[PDB]
């Protein structure tokens, strides 16, 4: 087995388009996801026009579920600008945004109404998205974070792409040209 | 391209080598990425700037990794730096489980190290002291993953912040998009 | 980009050809994984390029596998080389000792006594020594590893990362601080 990914069987559903969907499974607590967030955002700006990026928050343990809720609350609140902010506050600023109370405090700090945040954070719509989220994470057999799902048929990750067999031969080829000269 | 590249370290860390700009590589023997980059770091150090010194610092994100910190300093104390890179090979290629003193000592003895000597140095206060300092250094630099580099006590960079995933997963994602379009 | 220099560079014993060495171990699942690709690659390589596969041993327990490699080549049964990988990793056959190895070869048309004699021949012993010597000179730390022109070393793991980039940042940061 030399491939740098695995097939998702049975394949996952679509998003009614003709758009190749890419899913980035992340977690606000994951330093790797934090480090890569700006790369992913930048990548999305130049992605092929028939491709859509969907970032899905995951929870490997009960304590992570609130991080999922947070993600959706920010989206429903129409403040996607705060999304990358959560990473920075957590990883760069060392802020303990691990429970509703703490998150809400930070949310208000960013200009959000606590009352609205509170209600939206508990909304049945958010609770559903979270289910769907972990649900997708399960259908993808997520090994960790970050993890990527493509077209619902392929799943890859930093670890799965670690060994580049064909790549090594390709480098060997470059080296040959280098020593010949 | 979207890659942070590095981050500032605050407060800045003063060099522990008078007259030298320090480059600290935080690593762990159990880390696949550290094992993979070791020969490149070593090669890199051979041509490094004269006013620069490289130091390798074993980190521990949990207690169970502490023995691995102790191992790094013990080999240096025993003056067998030659075994340092071999540790990576043993764990990652020979799949030897050197995660405890007993397993380590056995391995050490297999490499011509006197078991009694190893067992002794491993618990030396010198080693214990350096292990404490390693973790304090890792903390001051807010290291959250390996490998990681602290430069001039002012910056912290890592392959991940430098865009390492563009050669891996992200490269595979672009390739997977093409394949699903087929 | 993703490669390490071999210091000092190894002398060439193939004038007029760029030598590529693949350090492998039959027990290595990654070497098993890439073997098919390496052979395909060899068929189309540049005419002034030559590939040599070198069995490596990190511990004593791995020497028999080196012996096996040179024994199959001495028996002129290169066809059995790729089969060792699949036999071990796909078929799960425990080909880890001369006896198990001889038996396995016997079922492939090889004269069992000829296998046993070549396996312990002075000739095979010499080549196993040279291999270990080459491994030491190239400072090989894992498998599979590729040495090119006796000067460079790269591998699947390095090719799957941008460690050189990470270090370049370090270089620039060194300059930044010194200011």
- DSSP symbols for chain B: ------EE-SSPPPPSSTT-EEEEEEE-TT-HHHHHHHHHHHHHHHT--TTEEEEEEE--SSGGGHHHHHHHHHHHHTT-TTHHHHHHHHHHTS-----SHHHHHHHHHHTT--HHHHHHHHT-HHHHHHHHHHHHHHHHTT--SSSEEEETTTEEE-TTTTTGGGTTHHHHHHHHHHHHH-
Closest CA to C137 of C1, C13, C2: C13
Query: Residue A17: enclosing H or E segment and its boundaries?
Result: none
| Tokens 């190894």, residue located | C10
Q: How many CB atoms lie within 10 A of CB C96?
A: 16
Q: Is A40 part of a structural domain of the chain?
A: yes
Instruction: Assess if residue A2 is contained within a domain.
Output: no
Residue indicated by tokens 């890859």: A156
**How many CB pairs below 8 A link B and C?**
108
A78-A80-A84 Cα angle (round to 5): 155
Cβ separation A163–C161 shorter than 8 A: no
Residues of C with CB under 8 A from a CB of A: 1-3, 18, 20, 30, 33-34, 37-38, 41, 46, 48-49, 144, 146, 148-149, 151-152, 154-161
CA distance A35 to A40: 10
Q: Searching chain A, which residue's CA lies closest to the CA of residue B7?
A: A92
Nearest to B153 by CA among B141, B138, B135, B136: B141
CB contact under 8 A, A171 and C161: no
Technique used: X-ray
Residue range(s) defining the domain that contains residue B111 = 12-157
Q: Which two tokens stand for residue A21?
A: 């969907």
On whether residue B180 sits in a domain, the answer given is: no
- Residue of C15, C16, C18 to mutate, interface with A, max A Cβ within 10 Å: C18
Classify residue B102: in a domain, yes or no: yes
Structure tokens at B59: 């980190």
Nearest CA in chain B to C59: B94
Assigned domain for A70 exists: yes
Query: How close A105 gets to chain B, by Cα (Å)?
Result: 24
Confirm if A15 and A50 have CB atoms less than 8 A apart. Answer: no
Other beta carbons less than 10 A from residue B33's beta carbon: 23
H or E, element range at C28: none
Q: Report how far residue B160's alpha carbon sits from residue B26's, in angstroms, rounded to the nearest whole number.
A: 14
Number of domains composing chain C: 1
> For the purposes of burial, counting CB atoms within 10 Å of the CB of A64, is it exposed (0-12), middle (13-18) or buried (19 or more)?
middle
- Which helix H or strand E contains C126, and what residues bound it? helix C122-137
Cβ neighbors of A173 (< 8 A, separation 6 or more) are none
State how far the Cα of B48 lies from the Cα of A74, in Å rounded to an integer: 46
Length of chain C: 179
Say yes or no for a CB contact (<8 Å) between B169 and A157: yes
The radius of gyration of chain C from alpha carbons, rounded to an integer in Å, stands at 19
Q: Report chain C residues whose CB lies below 8 A from the CB of A161.
A: 160
> Which CATH number fits the domain that encloses residue B53?
3.40.30.10
Greatest Cα pair distance in chain B:
63
Shortest CA distance from B161: residue in chain C: C166
Cα of A179 to nearest chain C Cα, Å: 6
Nearest to B145 among A32, A51, A146 (CB): A32
Dig out the tokens for C129 from the structure.
Answer: 């020594």
């Amino acid at each position: 087995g030399a491939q740098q990914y695995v097939n998702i069987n049975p394949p996952m559903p679509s998003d009614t388009p003709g758009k190749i969907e890419v899913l980035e499974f992340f977690a606000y607590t994951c330093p790797h996801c934090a480090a890569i967030e700006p790369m992913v955002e930048d990548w999305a700006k130049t992605a092929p026009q028939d491709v859509v990026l969907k970032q899905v928050p995951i929870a490997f343990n009960a304590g992570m579920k609130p991080l999922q809720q947070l993600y959706y609350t920010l989206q429903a609140l129409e403040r996607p600008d705060l999304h990358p902010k959560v990473f920075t506050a957590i990883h760069t600023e060392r802020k303990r945004l691990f429970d509703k109370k703490a998150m809400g405090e930070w949310a208000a700090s960013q200009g959000v109404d606590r009352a609205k945040f509170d209600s939206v954070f508990d909304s049945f719509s958010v609770q559903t998205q979270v289910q769907r989220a972990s649900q997708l994470a399960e259908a993808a057999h997520i090994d960790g974070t970050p993890a990527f799902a493509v077209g619902g048929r392929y799943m890859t990750s930093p670890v799965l792409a670690g060994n580049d067999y064909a790549g090594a031969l390709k480098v060997v080829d470059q080296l040959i040209v280098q020593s010949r000269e």
